[PDB]
Design a protein around this ligand. Structure first.
Ligand SMILES: Nc1ncnc2c1ncn2[C@@H]1O[C@H](COP(=O)(O)OP(=O)(O)O)[C@@H](O)[C@H]1O
Ligand SMILES: Nc1ncnc2c1ncn2[C@@H]1O[C@H](COP(=O)(O)OP(=O)(O)O)[C@@H](O)[C@H]1O
Ligand SMILES: Nc1ncnc2c1ncn2[C@@H]1O[C@H](COP(=O)(O)OP(=O)(O)O)[C@@H](O)[C@H]1O
Ligand SMILES: [Mg+2]
Ligand SMILES: [Mg+2]
Ligand SMILES: [Mg+2]
Lengths: 372, 372, 372
């Protein structure tokens, strides 16, 4: 009768909530803020660390640290503070009477999963847990059983193909280019017009400009010629100190790094060629079902016009006799968590939990035996 | 008096030299490098393409491409540059006064042989050339006239049985599993410990780790239990940036792919079962000589302990009443070239060249009538 | 025959002269002074503006303005007067018969470059003009073709890595902390001893104290304990009004802001961590030629003992098994100009000038196409 806690601990945001729902209960950025100046006024609850939204609102006097870098946890006390805040302050539930479902990027280091096991069973100890792959949860949320997943979050962009219920681990591709790299590239190219941003409190502003003002160009050279020709593609955004900024071609030079990674010095191919090479690394007889079931998920797949560009590039790459259909649901931003809300609700899933007792015999190594 | 040129065009390395020698004169990787960044300094011989050791030493600013993949030439301008470099810069000879010996994997497409014919008679035009099968050259280097040759290089792995001078073309097996796939699998399994390698300049480093630290386990499960029990099978390697890495079971998980191709999602059987099925696709009365003269050659047969594992697996597969001998010469890495240094020096061979006037009479198609 | 005019327009000083020389002909501060009081004596050539050393000598009755702050030109009439004084009074040459070389900080706004081009081609119109990056000129002056440059001046501190003639623009780092902020921090800490300095005529005096009495401490806490223990680190300087001042620990507290930017409220990392993070933002293979060729140039890298502190911090940051070399030429204060005297004298450079007819063909937009 105890509900399961689905907790997607992504690189930029945390989506935590109960199983069986439609939307995540607590969505908050995964930052830990610490005071950087000196305190003069005595009293009024001057905490030494702020986690989440109060770190976001008080960000002018705080240095912000992300505990997760490219899907890998680096600072463990900060991630412990993140888990404590999302268990006791957001969901307001006791973790010792609820199973927990966690997500993990493919091709992660093993010690990351082992330390999640050790912390989750020795500090916020649970009756049981499970660790799942995010792309499988995306196919849960889409409702299909076949297709290839382009899941691009804040640190990790990965392609996973699954045909008729079976995963293909030899064609899973991973690229470390995601929305934090696009935020840094927007920070680099915003100095062309004179707008200088340095601090992490300015990184949040640059992230807000990236979410509210950027879109994917359909044709790159035609859009650059249109931007250089007439002044009709410039938008204005108001900073929190009152200055207005006006940006032009930088609206579509930021998400073009997703298709051309050579802008930031990476010699890897674009995500369209990554998807095409991941499809051609599979068996030949299943490629027809993979072309018609392109499913994307994540926060950086919500750009305006990315679906038409993806369709055009894959249609150029694929032979002309085949049907390529791109699936972009309007609720992809939480769809991985939505898969958790499907996965923990199934009665057949309720035997695959890693129990506390099984951990007590098997040590912190059973999670590679059970969870794939 | 004109010394013939033996030039082994392997998938990863090029071994070129004169006839009659004991060692190849020029051994260099078949890598074409191109600039990937922008150049701000003016002068000092900034070329647009680097070939060989110059591309290997300056690999940090270059995109590295292999012109040969799985024994099939894909890029022809790069392969022409490779031939120009190995004729005019390495061997320092004029190709118009020397006959040429070329090597080729079995079951190759014929258009590869026709285009190398047209190139070697129209751009670096020679008095004559011959194209030979590499397993025949390995059997020449062994000095025997019977036996099965397992030649495994950088792109291909082929088994050819030859009894008393007559090869059996219906029992020739080809597998597309070689050291490039072992390098890619070493990249895939090195992310378990957090060491991420993505670039081709890093792929050379992963190749160096594969050559200097990997070995074939005699028993797989006992070695995995020994690695999980104690940390006595862990070695350390120093990266060029000063960082050190430590690897454990990954020393023997990488070359186990040759015996179990299901690790990388290949459905085909291992190399021992391939040799066994190739031997009893021959006739019954010759199998005693084929079991007693099992010869390996190539760079990926230089793994420490691969011969004992091969002996054990063929001993298990064959009936126990007879003698199975695995012949691994210490110099097998260049032995195909050594076979060329035997074959181009024989006086009986000097009537089997494909001359210039024969090519002009019969087009670029006579290489299928003459060369087998 | 007509030599080029190399004019380093820095934030605090202007270094102008002819191409092919070893030292800059005219080195003068980039200030414009204006009268602030009323004049009762009529005659004697009372100008309404003083530029250069004339404003420096008569600075007691003038308000001094810098036209360039943080490498960005703000006042254009003052910068035009600076250019007119360095063309017609210091160099005493006609600008219409000499090509001009200009220097510019990386990650600069492009409107600065286009207004510089429009002014140089329509007011002091030239046959040709090229704009270069200062770190490239520093590597031209040092004579090598590889290494990372920490170029720190009066407005900007930037790190640029260049390997074998190829620059890496994705690893170029810029920090807006330079000698002006050190001068302001020296004013902020000089009120501890009762010496108050407010005006720009006092800014020149505080700058002179910073140049002739400050040095970089090796170990900060040990020199703080030495200054608090015994009176041995106090120096005396004579002000122009005859008063003497005595300073103690403030000799090394001022240049510690370059290593600890948190003293002036900036949360950015130190310049040693900036160099380290720029080097590990490059590729792995080229880091050995970057640790062995660390070059600095500019005025604020001329502190006593900054090279030893640099070597100690990068030695601590790098792995201990690898050599770090710090290169500080004695003539770094003009070395960027020295690179101009190398760059404009090469015969290979003479085909990359922006001509007058090219500018009239292509507008003021060719300068981003040609000059990187
Ligand atoms: N409308 C939008 N346009 C572009 N990018 C967006 C948009 N909304 C969110 N993002 C990006 O998505 C990233 C986080 O996506 P998400 O996958 O939900 O979180 P996580 O990666 O932590 O799982 C943020 O860094 C943000 O920059
Ligand atoms: N000591 C070694 N152990 C394992 N593999 C090796 C060793 N030396 C070379 N190799 C592998 O052999 C491959 C090339 O073998 P070789 O046949 O000599 O060249 P090619 O295949 O180009 O003819 C390389 O990819 C390398 O990975
Ligand atoms: N001996 C010195 N010690 C410390 N700082 C110095 C010294 N000499 C000059 N400087 C500083 O260098 C700055 C100017 O350096 P430079 O790079 O030559 O000029 P710019 O930055 O205008 O190109 C001045 O602001 C001055 O404070
Ligand atoms: Mg996510
Ligand atoms: Mg070979
Ligand atoms: Mg300067």
């Amino acid at each position: 009768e105890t509900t399961a806690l689905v907790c997607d601990n992504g690189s930029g945001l945390v989506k935590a909530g109960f199983a069986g729902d439609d939307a995540p209960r607590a969505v908050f950025p995964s930052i830990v803020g610490r005071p950087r100046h000196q305190g003069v006024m005595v009293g009024m609850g001057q905490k030494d660390s702020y986690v989440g939204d109060e770190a976001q609102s008080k960000r002018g006097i705080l240095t912000l640290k992300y505990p997760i870098e490219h899907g890998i946890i680096t600072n463990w006390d900060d991630m412990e503070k993140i888990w404590h805040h999302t268990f006791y302050n957001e969901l307001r539930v006791a973790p010792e009477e609820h199973p927990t479902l966690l997500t993990e990027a493919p091709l992660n280091p093993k010690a990351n999963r082992e330390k999640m096991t050790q912390i989750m069973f020795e500090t916020f100890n649970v009756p049981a847990m499970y660790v799942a792959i995010q792309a499988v949860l995306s196919l849960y949320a889409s409702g299909r059983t076949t297709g290839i997943v382009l899941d691009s979050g804040d640190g990790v962009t990965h392609n996973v193909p699954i045909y008729e219920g079976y995963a293909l681990p030899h064609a899973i591709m991973r690229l470390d280019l995601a929305g934090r790299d696009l935020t840094d590239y927007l920070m680099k190219i915003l100095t062309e017009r004179g707008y200088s941003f340095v601090t992490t409190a300015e990184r949040e502003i640059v992230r807000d400009i990236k979410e509210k003002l950027c879109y994917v160009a359909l044709d790159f050279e035609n859009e650059m010629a249109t931007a250089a020709s007439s002044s009709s593609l410039e938008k204005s955004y108001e900073l929190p100190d009152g200055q207005v900024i006006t940006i032009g071609n930088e609206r579509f030079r930021c998400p073009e790094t997703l298709f051309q990674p050579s802008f930031i010095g990476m010699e890897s191919a674009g995500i369209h060629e990554t998807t095409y090479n991941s499809i051609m690394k599979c068996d030949i007889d299943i490629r027809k079902d993979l072309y018609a079931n392109n499913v994307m998920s994540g926060g950086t797949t919500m750009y305006p016009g990315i679906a038409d560009r993806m369709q055009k590039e894959i249609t150029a790459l694929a032979p002309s006799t085949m049907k390529i259909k791109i699936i972009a649901p309007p609720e992809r931003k939480y769809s991985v968590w939505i898969g958790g809300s499907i996965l923990a609700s199934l009665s057949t899933f309720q035997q695959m939990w890693i129990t506390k007792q099984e951990y007590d015999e098997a040590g912190p190594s059973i999670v590679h035996r059970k969870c794939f």
